[PDB]
Amino acid sequence: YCPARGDVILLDFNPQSGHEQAGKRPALVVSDDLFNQVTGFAVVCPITNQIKGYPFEVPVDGTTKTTGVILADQVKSLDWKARAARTVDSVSGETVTTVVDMVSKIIK
Amino acid sequence: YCPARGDVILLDFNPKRPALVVSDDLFNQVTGFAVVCPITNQIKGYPFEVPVDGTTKTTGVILADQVKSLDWKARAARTVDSVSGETVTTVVDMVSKIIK
C-alpha cells in the first residue's frame, strides 16, 4: 500500500499532550504517487466537517462516503507510515486541482 | 513580528530548529500560518534537497519534501537569517512538482 494523489486517507493524530483527542483524521493527498512511495511522506490537506466559509475551505467533491471541506492552507507533508495511513475514499480531479491551485498561490 | 518569505526562522520542536518560509508575507500575517521547509546539515543527496544560498549564519540543505504549514506564533517563530530569491524559487519549484 501507498497513498495515491486524490485519495482521502485516515491518518493517526497522536499528540502526547494538548486538549485535542487522539484518533484518526481524514485528509486529502495532493502529492504525486511516486513521491509518496519513494520518500515515505505524503503531502496532505486536512479534511473537516466544520464549514465556516473560510476562504481556503475547498468543498469535497466526487466522493463515495466523504463530506465536508478541505483546508488548503493547512497543507502538510506527513509520514504516512508512522501515522498508519489508510485510503478510504477519493475525490474528483478538479477537487485536487482547486486545492493545489490554492497552495501554489500561497507559496507564490 | 511576522515571518517573511525567504526568512530562515527557528521553530520549537517536539518528540529549536531552522526552517525556510516559502509562504507569502500577507498570508503569514493574516492566517497565522507559515508554510515552511526544514533545513538540515545532513546532505544525503536526496532529489528533493535544495542547497541553502545567500545567507549569513545558515548552512545545509532545505528539504522540500518535508514542507509543512504550521502556526508560527505557537511555535515561537523567530527570524535569524534569510536566503536569496533564487533559493526560494527553487524550493517552491520542487514543491509544486511534488503536488502536481
Binding site: G18, T48, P55, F56, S77, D79, R83, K105 | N14, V30
Partner: peptide, 29 residues
C-alpha cells in the same frame, strides 16, 4: 481567485484551529 482576494475574506469568525499539529516518525517539524 487572487491570494489577496482570498486573504481578504479571512475573519475572526472564519478561521480554523490547526489540524494534525503533532509530529510523527520522520517528520522534522
Amino acid at each position: 481567485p487572487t491570494l489577496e482576494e482570498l486573504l481578504g475574506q479571512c475573519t475572526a469568525e472564519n478561521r480554523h484551529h490547526e489540524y494534525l499539529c503533532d509530529s510523527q516518525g520522520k517528520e522534522m517539524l
